[PDB]
Design a protein around this motif. Structure first.
Motif, PDB file in Angstrom:
ATOM      1  N   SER A  14      41.359  42.945  53.633  1.00  0.00           N
ATOM      2  CA  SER A  14      41.245  41.528  53.323  1.00  0.00           C
ATOM      3  C   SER A  14      40.054  41.268  52.423  1.00  0.00           C
ATOM      4  O   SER A  14      40.108  40.398  51.549  1.00  0.00           O
ATOM      5  CB  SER A  14      41.136  40.712  54.606  1.00  0.00           C
ATOM      6  N   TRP A  15      38.969  42.012  52.625  1.00  0.00           N
ATOM      7  CA  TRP A  15      37.816  41.910  51.741  1.00  0.00           C
ATOM      8  C   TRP A  15      38.151  42.387  50.335  1.00  0.00           C
ATOM      9  O   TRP A  15      37.862  41.703  49.349  1.00  0.00           O
ATOM     10  CB  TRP A  15      36.668  42.729  52.308  1.00  0.00           C
ATOM     11  N   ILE A  16      38.757  43.569  50.226  1.00  0.00           N
ATOM     12  CA  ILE A  16      38.989  44.180  48.924  1.00  0.00           C
ATOM     13  C   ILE A  16      40.133  43.516  48.174  1.00  0.00           C
ATOM     14  O   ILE A  16      40.202  43.632  46.946  1.00  0.00           O
ATOM     15  CB  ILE A  16      39.241  45.690  49.082  1.00  0.00           C
ATOM     16  N   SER A  17      41.030  42.819  48.868  1.00  0.00           N
ATOM     17  CA  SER A  17      42.085  42.078  48.198  1.00  0.00           C
ATOM     18  C   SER A  17      41.608  40.723  47.704  1.00  0.00           C
ATOM     19  O   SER A  17      42.302  40.087  46.905  1.00  0.00           O
ATOM     20  CB  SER A  17      43.278  41.899  49.135  1.00  0.00           C
ATOM     21  N   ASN A  18      40.450  40.268  48.165  1.00  0.00           N
ATOM     22  CA  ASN A  18      39.868  39.033  47.668  1.00  0.00           C
ATOM     23  C   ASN A  18      39.056  39.237  46.401  1.00  0.00           C
ATOM     24  O   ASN A  18      38.532  38.260  45.860  1.00  0.00           O
ATOM     25  CB  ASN A  18      38.989  38.399  48.743  1.00  0.00           C
ATOM     26  N   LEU A  19      38.928  40.471  45.925  1.00  0.00           N
ATOM     27  CA  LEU A  19      38.211  40.717  44.686  1.00  0.00           C
ATOM     28  C   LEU A  19      38.966  40.114  43.513  1.00  0.00           C
ATOM     29  O   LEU A  19      40.112  40.482  43.241  1.00  0.00           O
ATOM     30  CB  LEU A  19      38.015  42.217  44.474  1.00  0.00           C
ATOM     31  N   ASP A  20      38.322  39.181  42.820  1.00  0.00           N
ATOM     32  CA  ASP A  20      38.916  38.530  41.665  1.00  0.00           C
ATOM     33  C   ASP A  20      38.009  38.733  40.465  1.00  0.00           C
ATOM     34  O   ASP A  20      36.786  38.612  40.570  1.00  0.00           O
ATOM     35  CB  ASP A  20      39.144  37.035  41.908  1.00  0.00           C
ATOM     36  N   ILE A  21      38.617  39.053  39.327  1.00  0.00           N
ATOM     37  CA  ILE A  21      37.862  39.281  38.107  1.00  0.00           C
ATOM     38  C   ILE A  21      37.396  37.952  37.537  1.00  0.00           C
ATOM     39  O   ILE A  21      38.159  36.982  37.469  1.00  0.00           O
ATOM     40  CB  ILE A  21      38.727  40.058  37.101  1.00  0.00           C
ATOM     41  N   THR A  22      36.122  37.888  37.150  1.00  0.00           N
ATOM     42  CA  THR A  22      35.583  36.697  36.496  1.00  0.00           C
ATOM     43  C   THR A  22      36.040  36.708  35.044  1.00  0.00           C
ATOM     44  O   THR A  22      35.331  37.137  34.134  1.00  0.00           O
ATOM     45  CB  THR A  22      34.066  36.643  36.591  1.00  0.00           C
ATOM     46  N   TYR A  23      37.263  36.236  34.833  1.00  0.00           N
ATOM     47  CA  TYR A  23      37.747  36.014  33.483  1.00  0.00           C
ATOM     48  C   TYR A  23      36.944  34.893  32.832  1.00  0.00           C
ATOM     49  O   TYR A  23      36.343  34.047  33.501  1.00  0.00           O
ATOM     50  CB  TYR A  23      39.230  35.651  33.498  1.00  0.00           C
ATOM     51  N   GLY A  24      36.932  34.886  31.511  1.00  0.00           N
ATOM     52  CA  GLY A  24      36.128  33.906  30.820  1.00  0.00           C
ATOM     53  C   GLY A  24      34.879  34.553  30.278  1.00  0.00           C
ATOM     54  O   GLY A  24      34.454  34.270  29.155  1.00  0.00           O
ATOM     55  N   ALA A  25      34.286  35.435  31.075  1.00  0.00           N
ATOM     56  CA  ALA A  25      33.255  36.321  30.567  1.00  0.00           C
ATOM     57  C   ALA A  25      33.841  37.484  29.787  1.00  0.00           C
ATOM     58  O   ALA A  25      33.097  38.190  29.100  1.00  0.00           O
ATOM     59  CB  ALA A  25      32.394  36.844  31.713  1.00  0.00           C
ATOM     60  N   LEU A  26      35.149  37.692  29.879  1.00  0.00           N
ATOM     61  CA  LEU A  26      35.862  38.722  29.141  1.00  0.00           C
ATOM     62  C   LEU A  26      36.748  38.163  28.047  1.00  0.00           C
ATOM     63  O   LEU A  26      36.833  38.752  26.973  1.00  0.00           O
ATOM     64  CB  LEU A  26      36.721  39.553  30.096  1.00  0.00           C
ATOM     65  N   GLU A  27      37.417  37.044  28.304  1.00  0.00           N
ATOM     66  CA  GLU A  27      38.290  36.435  27.315  1.00  0.00           C
ATOM     67  C   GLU A  27      37.474  35.809  26.194  1.00  0.00           C
ATOM     68  O   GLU A  27      36.365  35.314  26.404  1.00  0.00           O
ATOM     69  CB  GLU A  27      39.179  35.371  27.961  1.00  0.00           C
ATOM     70  N   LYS A  28      38.036  35.844  24.990  1.00  0.00           N
ATOM     71  CA  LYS A  28      37.416  35.192  23.848  1.00  0.00           C
ATOM     72  C   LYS A  28      37.676  33.695  23.911  1.00  0.00           C
ATOM     73  O   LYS A  28      38.812  33.263  24.121  1.00  0.00           O
ATOM     74  CB  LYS A  28      37.959  35.765  22.541  1.00  0.00           C
ATOM     75  N   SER A  29      36.623  32.906  23.726  1.00  0.00           N
ATOM     76  CA  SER A  29      36.753  31.456  23.744  1.00  0.00           C
ATOM     77  C   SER A  29      37.323  30.980  22.413  1.00  0.00           C
ATOM     78  O   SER A  29      36.791  31.314  21.349  1.00  0.00           O
ATOM     79  CB  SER A  29      35.402  30.803  24.021  1.00  0.00           C
ATOM     80  N   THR A  30      38.400  30.202  22.474  1.00  0.00           N
ATOM     81  CA  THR A  30      39.032  29.656  21.281  1.00  0.00           C
ATOM     82  C   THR A  30      38.375  28.368  20.806  1.00  0.00           C
ATOM     83  O   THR A  30      38.818  27.797  19.804  1.00  0.00           O
ATOM     84  CB  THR A  30      40.520  29.404  21.540  1.00  0.00           C
ATOM     85  N   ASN A  31      37.348  27.901  21.497  1.00  0.00           N
ATOM     86  CA  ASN A  31      36.678  26.659  21.136  1.00  0.00           C
ATOM     87  C   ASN A  31      35.914  26.826  19.832  1.00  0.00           C
ATOM     88  O   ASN A  31      35.040  27.700  19.744  1.00  0.00           O
ATOM     89  CB  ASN A  31      35.730  26.247  22.258  1.00  0.00           C
ATOM     90  N   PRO A  32      36.193  26.017  18.799  1.00  0.00           N
ATOM     91  CA  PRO A  32      35.483  26.060  17.517  1.00  0.00           C
ATOM     92  C   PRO A  32      34.004  25.717  17.650  1.00  0.00           C
ATOM     93  O   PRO A  32      33.605  24.958  18.533  1.00  0.00           O
ATOM     94  CB  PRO A  32      36.207  25.004  16.679  1.00  0.00           C
ATOM     95  N   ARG A  58      40.433  43.821  29.245  1.00  0.00           N
ATOM     96  CA  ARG A  58      40.174  42.498  28.693  1.00  0.00           C
ATOM     97  C   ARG A  58      38.853  42.452  27.936  1.00  0.00           C
ATOM     98  O   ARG A  58      38.773  41.858  26.857  1.00  0.00           O
ATOM     99  CB  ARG A  58      40.201  41.465  29.809  1.00  0.00           C
ATOM    100  N   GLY A  59      37.807  43.068  28.485  1.00  0.00           N
ATOM    101  CA  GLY A  59      36.511  43.040  27.832  1.00  0.00           C
ATOM    102  C   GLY A  59      36.470  43.841  26.546  1.00  0.00           C
ATOM    103  O   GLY A  59      35.839  43.429  25.573  1.00  0.00           O
ATOM    104  N   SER A  60      37.130  45.000  26.529  1.00  0.00           N
ATOM    105  CA  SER A  60      37.133  45.861  25.353  1.00  0.00           C
ATOM    106  C   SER A  60      37.884  45.244  24.187  1.00  0.00           C
ATOM    107  O   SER A  60      37.707  45.684  23.048  1.00  0.00           O
ATOM    108  CB  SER A  60      37.740  47.218  25.696  1.00  0.00           C
ATOM    109  N   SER A  61      38.729  44.249  24.446  1.00  0.00           N
ATOM    110  CA  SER A  61      39.357  43.518  23.356  1.00  0.00           C
ATOM    111  C   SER A  61      38.322  42.752  22.545  1.00  0.00           C
ATOM    112  O   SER A  61      38.492  42.570  21.335  1.00  0.00           O
ATOM    113  CB  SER A  61      40.418  42.575  23.917  1.00  0.00           C
ATOM    114  N   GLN A  62      37.244  42.307  23.190  1.00  0.00           N
ATOM    115  CA  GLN A  62      36.149  41.620  22.524  1.00  0.00           C
ATOM    116  C   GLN A  62      34.939  42.505  22.272  1.00  0.00           C
ATOM    117  O   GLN A  62      34.091  42.143  21.451  1.00  0.00           O
ATOM    118  CB  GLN A  62      35.704  40.399  23.342  1.00  0.00           C
ATOM    119  N   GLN A  63      34.838  43.647  22.948  1.00  0.00           N
ATOM    120  CA  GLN A  63      33.700  44.550  22.795  1.00  0.00           C
ATOM    121  C   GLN A  63      34.219  45.977  22.732  1.00  0.00           C
ATOM    122  O   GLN A  63      34.492  46.590  23.776  1.00  0.00           O
ATOM    123  CB  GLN A  63      32.705  44.390  23.938  1.00  0.00           C
TER     124      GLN A  63
END
Lengths: 48, 70, 338, 198, 158, 50, 158, 346, 159, 159, 158, 159
Positions: A30-48, L116-121
């Protein structure tokens, strides 16, 4: 003067140990299945 | 490209290690044919490993020529 | 208990947001800002705070109150974006919900600029960085609510909230979007946010709903197109005014009816009997956000910090206006609780 | 949910089984005393030791990640706090130290009993004593570690807010650490008269 | 027999399994959480990549401790071992496994937080290393208790 | 663009896109962005301008 | 041997010790940690000078003292050479359950009241007497549990 | 970790040897040691070519630590020789100290007889035995404890030399001497007990070989009682050592602050220092068990990578056998470089 | 004995434990909820503090009910008591404990709402007290049932 | 005996406890929810304070049903009672207790809604009382069933 | 006594309790939800108050079904009743009780919806009445099953 | 027999099933998480496809570990096998399977994040590879433990 011909003390100790171990395993899963990736720190922001 | 150099390194290590292994198999070394689970063939395994080492030598020569040429 | 599982995913986030809260201007720092008589002096004093050298790229002569507000807000936005980039799971959803209001603002801004035939690039540059979505520039294509909904808004997170355009129509659409969004965000807090943050966020969202409901009730009096059935469609259903005072305001036609409806609630009486209505709401929001910072393992701290920085930028911009325009008698008319 | 469904199903099965045994005249067939008598004292003693050390470490690590995540978050703006907020990490560690010490002291009792004296008064006593003292130390240490970690998180936050506020929360941390110490003391007293297996 | 029942090896085998499994779960949680933190950090600060790998390695040492205890209690296993011995191996496996589970979870949470903080504040790297050392000695303590039990496993067993 | 054109045209979309092999520099973002040549078919002047 | 003193009665006596101390520590920790969250909430808003804010934490600790006292008294009566009756074991289990759950409830109440009201009686000293009185009413629950545990221990030993 | 204080002993000079050699203890394979030595030799022989060359980050790190990698590889070859381990295989350099029975049947369990001692390294008779890990775990656990004890003692004598250089005799009397006596009289006593138990032939003498863990635990829990006697007068020596170690805690905690007061913050500083030192003296000795832990993990990974992949190829013949050998060597070398040299090395 | 097994005191001990446990849970809930309300209301009107103390006193009285029944069962507990005596003691403890738990939850909820209201409406204080007495008599009925049971615990009971 | 086993009083004691326990739980839910409604409404309209108290009284009456059944079961409870008597006492306790729990749920929900609505619509008070009577008669039916069972508990019962 | 065991009345008493308990739960849910709807609609339309009381009456009838079956089972209970009679009484109690629980659930949901809708559409009242009759007939089927079963309980029983 | 009961192969069959079942669960989680990341990143960066495929491959190697242990346990199963052999096979199956489940969790999480990160780095890919090797050896440790157990399964084992 036995507990049971089925639920012997040996079987009961094995089952109690299995239950404690499986409870630890279930809590850990239950602990290890609650691990969620902090997306947003990885995705590229499309905001100009 | 670096593919040729990587294959050259791996093939040189293959030649060295497989030659050592084939020699140890041929001499019926303790660490390689001592166990029951280990191959019973001995020198017959040594011949196969020698052939593999020769294949790696062919690869080594080809890639070493290519990397020098490139 | 709140601290038992909170720090697994939010310990770093909450520590950073509390550092941000420590960065909020104290009363002494506000007094030092007030003592300034030039905008350059204001920049000097504001560099002694956690704003720091945020205006160092701006020359002394180029310094304007709009620039000060823009750079302070940009600092806010970058801090929020950093905190949201470290978020996952329900905290990421919570901060996305925080951004949904700015999304609604951007939609209304885009449609307002479109019906006003403003430059598309100018409207896009003026869009809130928070609450940006990819199809936001596509909102300039039409001035029809149905056309923009099918074209753009059906794919946005604002799509659940929608269940030619003029200024009043855009106002109605924006307030309906806010009502739906506040209800959805309240439900999300109730079901997915742990207890201390749940209660704090329910209180804060209820206060925001009450502020909007009272504003709509008081501003519909000076209008004739706001039907009593339309007022019901604009008043949120999550506040302390709901459902009693919400129903009373949805039927009122005079200021005295609105005031009698607000005498129902012990939280908002005196708002209409003295002072300015907006000062009372700003003071109450800062009091609630100050109280939300007394909870240590609550994600409501992010919302409290966000609102406190928005109020702080408002205060600093007001002080900048009471420095630029002279008008030093009104310079102390800012809400400060930290 | 599913887990609550299993809880209800297990309760229903237990009640139905107990009522069936009771009504058929075999209520004593569910013999908890005979189960305690015939179960190995070694299972109880080893479960006590393992749960003692493991739960003490669970609490220590629990409070460590609580305090540490808060310290690192609060150190982005106030990196000064780290050096003296390590005291909270130490307070969480001392919990696992308690668990380790109890595990060593109790494992000193894990001698081999003779076949005909396996289930004697003293051996059954030692099994029960080590089991329950291990649970006492481990659970008190788990609770103390979680509590000390929560208080160290609040201490890191308060220290980052103001330097002067750290000492009061540190006193609260000492009050939290007393709990793990009391669990240690009670675990030692419960196994104090427990002989080694003979 | 009374002292060596047929099911006595069950506790030893399941203690070996627990020693590897719980420590691997702790190490996997640590690796996953710290690695997500590292990937998030190193998008904008790739220069800190190999500096941020430390929590992943300190998570791996947890699984290594579990492997050590599993090897020990596996080599102490036997068809006709005593119930004393089987419960000793169960206690060793459970102690190290639960300690490694806790230590790996703490390493994951603290390493995630600390790689992010060191991205923002380089002075936090040392503090994060210190907290991770504290979190790692917990798996070490579980290993130590397992070692004591395993050493005592061979005593006077007939 | 394809999703939006599908929704505005209410289905009835004949949309083709072809990859451009080389990325093209854009001054707005100062990025070498890959681009696609697209064509979409419709009759009415109003829908053309939309 | 004696039917009234079977050899498994110490299991229930020691279960009483464990219940007493563990549940009392749990209540004490709930109270201490939740009240400390309140104390930290006082921080950076109204930092005081004289520390009357430690009253909830002190009474939370007194709960663990209750549990300690009962556990020590139970463990004093548990010996492997003394005739421990099953009645004594059930009495000690009741001692532990009584004091431990009473202290757990006291800790819950103390934690709630401390977190909410330490801020409000540090801000205004007028509320001090009332909030301290509520905290005393929270403390007497654990006191009642300990009183019943003491009576049960006396009855079980005699 | 930190910049040295002005004129104190520099840790880098001991590190030159101790860091590569501790790595080597945890990386004790002659095969992987040779691979990493070859990488480091390529770095150091082309040192001038690689200087004035654009490297990057990974190449730059490898180049900067080229001599670190060189000593790690050389010492790893030496420690793999001592473990008698090369790519999970063993060397047969010298005559074994073990003689197998004269005759046995196919699949019979045979136990060897000690006919001597292997000159250098673990005896190759242990390769392929069903209790090889039983012996090597004791060996490597005691080796980890002993090497860690020596390293800690060397560092603490560096603290001595710092105190002499700065002429802080108060630190020698009240900080160095109590700590040295504590650390020796407990863990140096444990280390010498390990060595002595190694030196004594218990089977020949008929005495039971004492459990050193039990010995050490009962030294504190049950002073004056010896279960199995390691050496004569063990009870008296052990109680003297226990009283010495117990006295050394008030010694450290008081002699310096009382020297200040009788000839403040120094009291609390010294109390914190003594608590930290007493915890460290045990925790660091325990922490050196990671040498054995990582050596065990490294050896098991080498064995599983060899038994899988490359060893499977040896059972086939013909063209299929040759291709299978080539492919499985490529796989084994890739996993050796990526898992053993790269993961386990890091 | 058939009528007085050696495990007969288990039921009485669990009854005593339940009497303490559930009345303490109820009193703790009542005290916590009421105190949260009291503190939230006294932030503006401190003089009403001693008026709002009432629900905390009701919760305390619930805890005292539990204590009384536990003491009575303790002094009824014996090594050679009947299984019927143990059943009676268990029933008494369960009744007082769980009735007082229900009373304590009602007291916590009602007292929270009532102190919140009384901070606004001074006339609602008497209504709060009335509803609180109605929530209190639940624990009182549990007490009464427990006392009646305990009076019948060893009444015409054969050893 | 066979018809009167030693454990037979366990079911009777559990029934006596459960009567008061579950009727107290239902009464507590009713009192708590209706009292929250009352405190909400009587902040502005204290004149309705004693009209709005009737759902609290009706939850209390539910608890009184439970107390009555508990007393009656307690006084028919003996060491050598029949197993049939214990089954009947358990059935009476369960019926009254859980019917009173359901009735108290309904009392709380309906009374909360009705006091909140009656503050706005004075005519809604009669409707509230009617629905509250319909909710109260649920506990009344449980009480009737419990009294009938209890009357059959020791009638024609031997051994 | 082999086929009329001592525990035979247990199932009869449990069925007698279940009948009234579950029909009271269904009636309580129906009454609560219908009454919430009534109080919600009668604020603005108090004229419809006595029309909207119908679902509450239907739920009350569900409870009356349960009471009828409870009385019949109670009067068929005996100390030396057959185990078959106890099984039949348990079945009748479960039938009427759980069928009336379902019927009360349907009545509550539908009556809430219908009282809220009838205030906006007067002609929806007859539709709500029809749906409520359909919901009530579920508990009536349960009652019919219970009555037939109870009729079989002592028929040709030894 | 006593040492070789009829149910002894039950634990062996459960261990053989468990090996592949839990390693396939871990491999499935790793494949699914990493594949969601790969399909997310390779919409905009199709060139990185065969480079991001690496976590999927290592997730698959987890299931290969499980398959190896399943085969080795399967060929040691027998009708008259000892209960010790069954326990050893069960322990090996659980070892490899649950260690592989943990490794697949780590591989899926880290592969998703790093793809996901390596796509930007682009520099993040080597770090992902290192972290993923560290995650893979978690399952490889379980493979080691299972192989050791299996080696001891029929060693010194009698009927």
């Amino acid at each position: 003067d036995i507990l049971s011909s089925i639920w012997t003390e040996g079987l009961l100790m094995c089952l109690i140990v299995s239950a404690l171990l499986l409870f630890i395993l279930i809590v850990a899963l239950s602990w290890i299945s609650n691990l969620d990736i902090t997306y947003g720190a990885l995705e590229k922001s499309t905001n100009p | 490209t670096g593919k040729a150099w990587c294959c050259t390194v791996l093939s040189a290590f293959g030649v060295v290690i497989l030659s050592v292994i084939a020699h140890l198999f041929n001499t019926n070394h303790e660490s390689f044919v001592g166990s029951i689970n280990d191959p019973e063939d001995g020198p017959a395994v040594a011949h196969t490993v020698y052939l593999a080492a020769l294949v790696y030598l062919v690869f080594f020569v080809f890639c070493g020529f290519q990397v020098y040429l490139a | 208990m709140e601290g038992v599982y909170f720090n697994i995913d939010n310990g770093f986030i909450e520590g950073v947001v509390r550092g941000y809260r420590n960065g909020l201007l104290s009363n002494n720092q506000y007094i030092n800002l007030t003592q300034c008589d030039t905008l350059e002096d204001l920049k000097l004093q504001l560099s002694s705070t956690d704003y720091g050298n945020f205006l160092s790229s701006v020359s002394s002569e180029s310094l304007t109150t709009s620039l000060i507000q823009e750079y302070a807000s940009s600092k806010l936005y970058h801090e929020f974006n950093y905190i949201r980039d470290q978020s996952s799971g329900s905290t990421r959803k919570f901060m996305d919900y925080i951004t949904y209001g700015y999304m609604i603002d951007n939609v209304a801004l885009m449609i307002t600029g479109t019906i006003h035939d403003r430059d598309k690039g100018e409207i896009l540059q003026r869009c809130h960085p928070l609450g940006w979505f990819d199809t936001l520039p596509t909102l300039s294509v039409a001035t029809d609510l149905e056309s923009l909904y099918e074209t753009v808004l059906v794919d946005t997170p604002l799509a659940p909230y929608f269940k030619e355009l003029d200024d009043m129509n855009i106002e109605i659409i924006r307030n309906k979007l806010y009502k739906a969004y506040l209800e959805d965000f309240y439900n999300f807090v109730t079901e997915e946010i742990p207890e201390p943050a749940k209660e704090c966020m329910q209180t804060l969202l209820g206060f925001e709903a009450d502020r909007r409901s009272i504003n709509i009730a008081l501003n519909s009096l000076q209008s004739s197109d706001i039907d009593p059935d339309l007022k019901s469609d604009l008043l949120p259903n999550i506040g302390k005014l709901y459902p009693l005072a919400t129903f009373h305001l949805a039927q009122a036609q005079d200021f005295e009816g609105v005031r009698a409806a607000l005498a129902n609630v012990y939280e908002y009486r005196g708002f209409l009997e003295t002072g300015n209505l907006e000062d009372h709401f700003y003071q109450l929001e800062m009091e609630l956000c100050r109280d939300a910072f007394t909870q240590q393992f609550a994600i409501s701290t992010v919302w409290a910090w966000m609102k406190s920085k928005e109020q702080e930028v408002r205060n600093i911009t007001w002080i900048a206006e009471c420095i630029a325009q002279n008008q030093r008698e009104r310079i102390n008319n800012y809400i400060s609780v930290y | 949910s599913f887990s609550h469904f299993l809880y209800y199903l297990v309760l229903i099965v237990v009640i139905v089984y107990g009522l069936y045994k009771l009504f058929t005249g075999h209520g004593s067939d569910i013999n908890f005393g005979k189960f305690l008598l015939r179960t190995s004292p070694y299972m109880w003693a080893n479960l006590g030791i393992a749960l003692c050390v493991g739960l003490s470490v669970v609490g220590a690590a629990w409070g460590i990640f609580i305090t540490g995540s808060s310290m690192i978050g609060a150190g982005v703006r106030a990196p000064r706090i780290t050096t003296k907020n390590l005291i909270s990490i130490i307070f969480c560690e001392v919990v696992a130290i308690y668990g380790l010490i109890i595990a060593i002291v109790f494992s000193s009792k894990l001698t081999v009993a003779t076949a005909e004296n396996m289930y004697s008064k003293s051996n059954l006593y030692t099994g029960y004593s080590l089991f329950w003292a291990g649970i006492t130390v481990g659970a008190s240490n788990l609770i103390c570690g979680i509590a000390v970690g929560i208080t160290g998180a609040t201490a890191a936050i308060s220290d980052a807010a103001d330097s002067a506020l750290f000492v009061k929360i540190l006193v609260i941390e000492i009050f939290g650490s007393i709990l793990g110490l009391l669990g240690l003391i009670v675990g030692l007293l419960m196994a104090g008269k427990a002989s080694e297996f003979q | 027999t009374e002292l060596c029942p047929v099911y006595a090896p069950f506790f030893g085998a399941i203690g070996c399994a627990s020693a590897i499994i719980f420590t691997s779960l702790g190490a996997a949680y640590g690796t996953a959480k710290s690695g997500v933190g590292i990937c998030a950090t190193c998008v904008l600060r790739p220069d800190l990549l190999f500096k941020n790998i430390v929590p992943v390695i300190m998570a791996g040492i947890i699984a290594i401790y579990g492997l050590v205890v599993s090897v020990l209690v596996c080599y102490s296993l036997g068809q006709k071992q005593a119930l004393y011995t089987g419960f000793i191996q169960l206690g060793a496996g459970l102690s190290v496994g639960l300690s490694g589970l806790a230590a790996g979870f703490a390493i994951g949470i603290v390493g995630d937080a600390g790689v992010r903080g060191s991205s923002q504040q380089p002075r936090l790297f040392v503090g994060m290393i210190l907290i991770l050392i504290f979190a790692e000695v917990l798996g070490l303590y579980g290993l130590i208790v397992a070692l004591l039990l395993n050493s005592r496993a061979t005593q006077d067993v007939v | 663009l394809e999703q939006i054109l599908w929704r505005v045209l209410r289905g009835n979309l004949f949309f083709k896109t072809v990859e451009i092999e080389q990325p093209v520099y854009d001054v707005k973002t100062r990025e070498y962005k890959h681009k696609n040549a697209f064509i979409v078919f419709s009759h009415g002047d109003l829908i053309i301008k939309r | 041997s004696n039917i009234y003193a079977p050899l498994y009665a110490p299991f229930f006596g020691f279960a009483g010790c464990a219940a007493a101390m563990v549940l009392s520590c749990l209540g004490a920790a709930i109270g201490t940690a939740k009240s400390g969250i309140g104390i930290a909430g006082i921080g950076t808003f109204k930092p005081e000078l004289i520390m009357k804010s430690l009253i909830p934490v002190v009474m939370s600790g007194i709960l663990a003292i209750y549990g300690l006292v009962v556990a020590v008294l139970i463990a004093g009566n548990l010996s492997p050479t003394e005739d421990y009756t099953l009645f004594n074991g059930f009495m000690h289990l009741s001692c532990g359950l009584c004091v431990g759950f009473a202290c757990l409830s006291s800790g819950y109440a103390i934690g709630m009241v401390g977190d909410v009201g330490v801020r409000k009686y540090m801000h205004q000293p007028r509320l001090f007497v009332g909030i301290v009185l509520i905290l005393i009413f929270s403390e007497v629950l654990g006191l009642y549990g300990m009183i019943v545990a003491l009576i049960l221990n006396t009855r079980g030993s005699e | 970790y930190g910049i040295a204080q002005y004129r104190e002993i520099n840790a880098g000079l001991p590190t030159i040897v101790t860091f590569p050699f501790m790595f080597a203890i945890m990386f004790g394979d002659m095969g992987h040691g040779f691979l990493m030595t070859l990488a480091a030799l390529s770095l150091v022989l082309n040192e001038k070519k690689i200087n004035k060359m654009k490297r990057g980050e990974i190449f730059d790190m490898a180049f900067t630590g080229r001599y670190i990698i060189l000593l790690m590889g050389v010492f790893s070859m030496y420690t793999g020789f001592l473990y008698n381990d090369i790519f999970s295989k063993t060397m047969t350099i010298f005559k074994s100290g073990w003689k197998w029975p004269d005759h046995w049947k196919k699949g019979e369990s045979i136990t060897a007889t000690s006919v001597g001692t292997y000159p250098i390294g673990l005896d190759w008779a242990w390769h392929g035995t069903e209790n090889a890990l039983l012996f090597s775990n004791s060996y490597k656990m005691k080796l980890s404890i002993l090497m860690g004890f020596i390293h800690m003692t060397y560092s603490y004598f560096f603290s001595l030399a710092n105190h002499l250089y700065f002429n802080s005799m108060i630190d020698i009397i009240g900080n160095f001497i109590p700590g040295l006596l504590f650390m020796q009289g407990i863990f140096g006593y444990l280390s010498v007990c390990i060595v002595y138990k190694w030196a004594v032939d218990w089977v020949k003498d008929g005495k039971p070989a004492p459990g050193l863990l039990n010995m050490l635990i009962n030294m504190f829990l049950s002073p004056g009682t010896i279960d199995d006697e390691l050496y004569p007068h063990q009870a008296k020596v052990q109680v003297f050592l226990l009283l010495m170690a117990l006295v050394c805690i008030p010694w450290l905690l008081l002699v310096k602050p009382l020297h200040f007061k009788f000839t403040g913050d120094i009291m609390i500083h010294q109390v914190i220092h003594t608590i930290e030192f007493c915890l460290n003296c045990v925790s660091h000795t325990a922490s050196y068990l990671r040498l054995w832990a990582l050596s065990l993990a490294h050896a098991q990974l080498s064995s599983v990578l060899w038994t899988m992949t490359i060893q499977i190829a040896f059972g086939f013949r013909g063209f299929v056998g040759v291709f299978m050998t080539v492919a499985l060597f490529a796989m084994w070398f890739a996993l050796t470089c990526a898992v053993l040299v790269l993961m386990e090395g890091t």
